[PDB]
# Entry
Amino acid sequence: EVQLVESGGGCVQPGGSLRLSCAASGFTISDYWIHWVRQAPGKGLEWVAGITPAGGYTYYADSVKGRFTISADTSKNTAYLQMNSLRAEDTAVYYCARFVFFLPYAMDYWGQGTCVTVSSASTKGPSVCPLAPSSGGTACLGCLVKDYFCECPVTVSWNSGALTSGVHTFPAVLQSSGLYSLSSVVTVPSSSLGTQTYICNVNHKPSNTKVDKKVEP
Amino acid sequence: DIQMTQSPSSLSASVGDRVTITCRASQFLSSFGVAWYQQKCGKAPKLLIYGASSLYSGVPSRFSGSGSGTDFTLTISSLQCEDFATYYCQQGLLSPLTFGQGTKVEIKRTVAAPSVCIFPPSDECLKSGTASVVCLLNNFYPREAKVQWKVDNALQSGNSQESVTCQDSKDCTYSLSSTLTLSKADYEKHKVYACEVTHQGLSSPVTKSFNRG
Amino acid sequence: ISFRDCAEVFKSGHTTNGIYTLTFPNSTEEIKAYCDMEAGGGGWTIIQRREDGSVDFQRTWKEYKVGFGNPSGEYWLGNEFVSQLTNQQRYVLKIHLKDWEGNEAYSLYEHFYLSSEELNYRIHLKGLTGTAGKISSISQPGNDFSTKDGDNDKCICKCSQMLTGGWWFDACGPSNLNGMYYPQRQNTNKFNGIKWYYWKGSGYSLKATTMMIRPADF
Ligand SMILES: [Ca+2]
# Structure
């Protein structure tokens, strides 16, 4: 298998600095280019930088040239992006991608992405409120995550991921307090209530908050 | 730099229709260097087409592309409900490696009525003093659902927020949730809380209600 | 006597097609070149020919400097000699093209010369007339020459390796007459074929080519 796994995103102050790490698995990075692409909230894809590890050649978009620095570390099959003098405009998901420079000549494999949020605000951790099973042969269940700052790396899975049919997770919304909130809901047979203990697992990496909470009437 | 311009910024077409996305470069591009990517809600992009016209492995053969010089095109020969995505051209030739602006594909479908749920706030949430009341609409089309919140028949306004998920990638329906917010010192005054839903798939507005406080 | 180019050979009365010997300007090193004495008033020094694919063109920087092939058929005369000539006086460049269906086209440039080796034999072209397109399929302003070792192009790629030849490649521009040769029914959809975009588009590989130079006094 071929994977790229980037890591090290988070919340940081303006003017701060951060170092994204893209670990490559199943291939030797020396035989391909590594490129970084970012996507600001609601915007298109912007190409950030790329490196030829067999040669050290580096390329940058004008937007970041002389602030960021891409590098590669072949003894760990890993590529880095040092970010300096960060701004609000640097808030995006960042993806590392393998670029095949022979005949496919395209970015065939991509990483999952990592969130960078550049914001002068406290990383308030979430509180999680269960929404009781409420009425058709079926019931809606839900799990409400509210009042947390540093959106993006907030994940809500059900029964440790064993339940996914009919799980809807909604986009987070910014409240007038400036804190984010989101709802996750699932639909289940009415006859399944009590026969199954539905629990929502919530994890919010910027505040290192993991809480698993049971939902029942 | 090379500017990549995509001519439709979005399009909406029915299941079966044929759609085309035109990407135009400001400079001659060697056609081996042009690629097309698909991205779906909360996913990394994926390669569809390389070398202006070569279908990437495992991509459905309904996708195709053509072009040379300045002008390139992406075709979906018969649009399927899972083709709901944003599509990007890119040039991989002259640094910096500009993407196109993207194109969003929306899929037209026959109407479906929303299944409506209402949730009372649990006591867990009446601690910390803020009562949030949730109304939920499942699997409807088109997107233009209207909620209203009524409390003892008093029409509420300004204290609600809507969130709408993406199209279901097998059914092309939406879901929406509305959240009412009140202080505990307000939630406990009034008795009857109601969510009223109006949508094109309903001959008359649905209502769901509970009573507490 | 010595002759520097085929136009002098012609003015001496050797008015017949053949291989002749030419002498480097201000030197005694000799080169052998094909002179076309019958087309267009003669005096044309052929600098490149393609006909049948009998000769490989994926050569090194040194080979394109010196020249390679056989002057009787497919060959490259060499950047050094062409650089030494075309910096002495004004030369025109005529390019003659054939496709597999039997059509003819040409481009004429009213000034051609190559920079020196320290400027990577950069091409300079001016004016354009003829029928093989109304835009120059060689990018302007002209690029450095590039080969499978000498990557002097504007691509972040290596154009000479993706398009398999030595050319003034750009990134990677609309032409490459030194590309792969594809025979009678394989020449379509070939991105690395003998390319001249403004006549037959991309992916079409030409049948035959001839690049040749003559003084603009002639
Ligand atoms: Ca290059």
